[PDB]
């Protein structure tokens with residue numbers, strides 16, 4: 001049972017993703033996060049190979065949780081009469097990227113480069129596992145402050161990756177692409193790249209570029225902070241109005257701005273320790 005197997009600590013947060021508590025695995029004192037969601041609040045369902053009816057979140061997490069990666073891994077899950085409970089990794093010490101940027105302001109480009117590179121590798125991992133996250137944003141990125149490693153959280157808005165059109169979106173609006181605003185249609189990979197452009201801007205400017213729909217569809221990116229010409233170019237490319245004009249993951253990682261990335265360890269030593 002969950003209750004004897006885990007020592008439950010304080011609430012870490014709650015919202016659309018349910019309620020998440022800090023925890024410790026009793027057997028070996030592993031730090032964990034314990035996520036509860038009411039069955040009545042679960043819109044998207046899937047099934048395991050053996051036909052157990054589970055939240056799609058569990059299917060997606062299982063797909064991305066094999067091997068080591070920049071994704072918070074699903075360690076176990078439990079079904080209760082009225083809810084599911086998910087046991088996730090918890091780094092320590094940790095801070096989400098939203099809080100990090102709020103506290104420290106716009107990031108030095110060396111740090112933004114290391115962070116952005118890691119998110120790109122994590123997103124490539126998800127896509128290789130057949131999973132689209134669909135809510136990439138600063139709030140869903142955890143920084144392991146000692147190891148300098150970034151981890152993606154919250155697959156609650158995600159989907160199985162497909163090559164055909166998506167007509168549903170329950171992710172974060174201001175990180176949502178103009179084709180969604182205009183047509184309620186997007187393709188996974190090019191929508192992902194849009195969200196990555198928003199994230200990169202957020203990192204080097206300290207806030208997101210667009211508030212209103214009209215800015216999102218407008219085709220203009222204004223820089224409020226000093227940002228290098230190469231970084232501006234990459235951001236503007238990721239934020240191309242036409243989805244087909246956006247870079248692939250390969251083209252992003254080959255962009256001149258992305259060269260000579262720091263290792264996670266170096267990043268921690270220079271910027272986080």
Ligand SMILES: CN(C)C[C@@H]1CCn2cc(c3ccccc32)C2=C(C(=O)NC2=O)c2cn(c3ccccc23)CCO1
Pocket residue numbers: 012013014017020032033035072088089090091094095096139140142153154155
């Ligand atoms: C807005 N929301 C996403 C923020 C998040 C919200 C609470 N939350 C923590 C959380 C997740 C995962 C998926 C959805 C929501 C989560 C997890 C962790 C974690 O280490 N493993 C997790 O699974 C944490 C996220 N955070 C942690 C802070 C301190 C300890 C642990 C934290 C970030 C703050 O809470």
